[PDB]
Design an enzyme around this catalytic site. Structure first.
Site, PDB file in Angstrom:
ATOM      1  N   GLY A  72       0.781  -1.222   0.000  1.00 19.19           N
ATOM      2  CA  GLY A  72       0.000   0.000   0.000  1.00 19.19           C
ATOM      3  C   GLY A  72       0.820   1.283   0.000  1.00 19.19           C
ATOM      4  CB  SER A 118      -3.342  -4.560  -3.898  1.00 15.93           C
ATOM      5  OG  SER A 118      -3.360  -5.136  -2.605  1.00 15.93           O
ATOM      6  CG  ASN A 133      -6.521   2.979   3.285  1.00 22.02           C
ATOM      7  OD1 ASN A 133      -6.879   2.528   2.198  1.00 22.02           O
ATOM      8  ND2 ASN A 133      -6.072   2.207   4.273  1.00 22.02           N
ATOM      9  CE1 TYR A 147      -3.853   5.673  -0.330  1.00 25.85           C
ATOM     10  CE2 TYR A 147      -4.675   6.824  -2.254  1.00 25.85           C
ATOM     11  CZ  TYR A 147      -3.796   6.737  -1.202  1.00 25.85           C
ATOM     12  OH  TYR A 147      -2.860   7.714  -1.033  1.00 25.85           O
ATOM     13  CG  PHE A 181      -7.653  -2.888  -4.759  1.00 24.87           C
ATOM     14  CD1 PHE A 181      -8.487  -3.989  -4.897  1.00 24.87           C
ATOM     15  CD2 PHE A 181      -6.659  -2.938  -3.800  1.00 24.87           C
ATOM     16  CE1 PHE A 181      -8.349  -5.099  -4.084  1.00 24.87           C
ATOM     17  CE2 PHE A 181      -6.516  -4.046  -2.982  1.00 24.87           C
ATOM     18  CZ  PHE A 181      -7.363  -5.121  -3.117  1.00 24.87           C
ATOM     19  CB  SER A 240      -8.889  -4.548   0.234  1.00 24.12           C
ATOM     20  OG  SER A 240      -9.320  -3.201   0.160  1.00 24.12           O
ATOM     21  CG  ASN A 296     -11.061   0.567   1.584  1.00 26.23           C
ATOM     22  OD1 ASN A 296     -11.923   0.865   2.410  1.00 26.23           O
ATOM     23  ND2 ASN A 296      -9.763   0.637   1.844  1.00 26.23           N
ATOM     24  CB  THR A 297     -12.530  -4.135  -3.221  1.00 23.95           C
ATOM     25  OG1 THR A 297     -11.515  -3.228  -3.659  1.00 23.95           O
ATOM     26  CG2 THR A 297     -13.093  -4.888  -4.428  1.00 23.95           C
ATOM     27  CE  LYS A 348      -2.128  -6.946   4.362  1.00 25.49           C
ATOM     28  NZ  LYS A 348      -1.323  -5.807   3.831  1.00 25.49           N
ATOM     29  CB  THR A 393      -4.488  -8.197  10.213  1.00 22.35           C
ATOM     30  OG1 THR A 393      -4.320  -6.961  10.931  1.00 22.35           O
ATOM     31  CG2 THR A 393      -4.561  -9.355  11.210  1.00 22.35           C
ATOM     32  CG  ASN A 394      -5.720  -5.323   4.514  1.00 25.14           C
ATOM     33  OD1 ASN A 394      -5.665  -4.100   4.631  1.00 25.14           O
ATOM     34  ND2 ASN A 394      -5.678  -5.937   3.326  1.00 25.14           N
TER      35      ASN A 394
END
Ligand SMILES: Cc1cc2nc3c(=O)[nH]c(=O)nc-3n(C[C@H](O)[C@H](O)[C@H](O)COP(=O)(O)O)c2cc1C
Ligand SMILES: CC(C)[C@H]1CC(=O)c2nnn(-c3cc(F)c(-c4cccc(N(C)C)c4)c(F)c3)c2C1
Ligand SMILES: CCCCCCCCCCCC[N+](C)(C)[O-]
Ligand SMILES: O=C(O)c1cc(=O)[nH]c(=O)[nH]1
Length: 363
Positions: A64, A87, A112, A114, A116, A182, A184-185, A222, A250-251
């Site tokens: 990231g 990623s 965050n 973002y 991806f 993630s 955020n997807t 991950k 972790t994430n």
């Protein structure tokens, strides 16, 4: 307690924060790093052998920071024992609209979303090809390279996105990360479920196994810190069943721990930094036990000190990563963590990092 450490932490980084929004600061950080505009010698004690490679020290840069593979050599120069980029998604995509990165200085945290943002596999492929042999020598010198793989927002077949990543960047990586965590997807984390994960990881491993030997990377998964006990059991089972080479733990977290003070604490996205630290450490502890210590773990989340690093190692991590700490300490944080870690190892009677891995489980 170097001079650079205090200067960056007390003066330079607070000033940069005051002048630049988090994403602009991120872009500048990448630029400066890529150009080697940067301010400790690794001892044998910090050397680790895992995932089929030597790591001259156990402190890596987490995914990231260098999403598009633009600052790899600068990151080794910063003192990281290994570098993870990504990623990376199959096709280029812009990610979410701005603003999408937020500082929580009162919490030593960032949020965050973002989404991806990625230059895509082709661009990153050519970027890594341009330094492929240099990397071969770095890897042989104990400075390995990881490539973290994502999937496109509009993708219809998630497994095919990861398969493409394996085919295109697998040959350029010492290890690959199937980033299935993630926040955020949309729908991405559901790929952490047992049935989905087994199918997904089976395809990834098959594609990996199809690569020529010297171009055949380790494959790690991950995972998020927000998994149920059931989720963790399932992941441990699938990982052992399929012979996955390791876990990254972790994430960021979609939870918001009680006590956050930052004004931006209720922004949507993944939370990183200190509020994540012990949540991450406990997830390492659990995954280590569930896999009987036989599956290498890279521990990540809220590391800013040797103590933070050692806690994750003793919980079961063979390696650690950091990212968010850079916002508050800057580049000197890397040497700081390495120096403090070495001292603690000596202080607690460990011959080296390797002796400390999983040590909390053996007492
Ligand atoms: C701005 C930002 C972007 C990130 N992007 C990615 C990413 O693309 N892929 C990934 O696997 N993790 C990503 N992460 C998560 C980090 O790799 C790491 O797992 C997490 O931030 C916890 O470590 P830290 O507290 O030291 O930052 C990102 C984190 C941040 C803060
Ligand atoms: C987590 C990420 C999204 C952001 C979040 C955020 O709010 C932030 N604020 N500042 N900052 C940041 C800026 C920087 F310029 C460097 C840097 C890198 C290399 C060299 C130098 N110098 C020579 C001084 C500086 C840095 F390491 C971090 C960040 C990172
Ligand atoms: C400059 C700000 C420093 C903040 C340092 C934070 C120390 C650890 C506290 C966060 C703990 C979050 N929790 C509840 C999940 O454990
Ligand atoms: O790209 C992003 O938003 C992102 C991806 C990921 O894996 N983790 C995170 O915190 N953000």
């Amino acid at each position: 307690a170097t001079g650079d450490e205090r200067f960056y932490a007390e003066h330079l980084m607070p000033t940069l924060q005051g002048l630049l929004d988090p994403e602009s600061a991120h872009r500048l950080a990448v630029r400066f790093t890529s150009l080697g505009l940067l301010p400790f010698q690794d001892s044998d004690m910090l050397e680790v052998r895992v995932l089929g490679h030597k790591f001259r020290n156990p402190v890596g840069i987490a995914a990231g920071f260098d999403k598009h593979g633009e600052a790899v050599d600068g990151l080794y120069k910063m003192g990281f024992g290994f570098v993870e980029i990504g990623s990376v998604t199959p096709k280029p995509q812009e990610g979410n609209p701005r603003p999408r990165v937020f500082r929580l200085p009162e919490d030593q945290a960032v949020i965050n979303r973002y989404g991806f943002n990625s230059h895509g596999l082709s661009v990153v492929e050519h970027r890594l090809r341009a330094r492929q042999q240099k990397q071969a020598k770095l890897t042989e010198d104990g400075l390995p390279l990881g490539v973290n793989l994502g999937k496109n927002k509009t993708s219809v077949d998630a497994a095919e996105d990861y398969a493409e990543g394996v085919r295109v960047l697998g040959p350029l990586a010492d290890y690959l990360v199937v980033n299935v965590s993630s926040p955020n997807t949309a729908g991405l984390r559901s790929l952490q479920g047992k049935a989905e994960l087994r199918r997904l990881l089976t395809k990834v491993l098959q594609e990996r196994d199809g690569l020529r030997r010297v171009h055949r990377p380790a494959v790690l998964v991950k995972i998020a810190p927000d998994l149920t006990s059931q989720d963790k059991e399932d992941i441990a089972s699938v990982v052992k069943e399929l012979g996955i080479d390791g876990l990254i733990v972790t994430n960021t977290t979609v939870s918001r721990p009680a006590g956050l003070q930052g004004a931006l604490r209720s922004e949507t996205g993944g939370l990183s930094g200190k509020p994540l630290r012990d949540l991450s450490t406990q997830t390492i502890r659990e995954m280590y036990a569930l896999t009987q210590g036989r599956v290498p773990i890279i521990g990540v989340g809220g590391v800013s000190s040797g103590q933070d690093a050692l806690e994750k190692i003793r919980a079961g991590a063979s390696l650690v990563q950091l990212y968010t700490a850079l916002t508050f300490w800057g580049p000197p944080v890397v040497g700081k963590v390495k120096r403090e870690l070495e001292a603690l190892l000596k202080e607690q009677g460990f011959g080296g990092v390797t002796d400390a891995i999983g040590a909390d489980h053996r007492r």
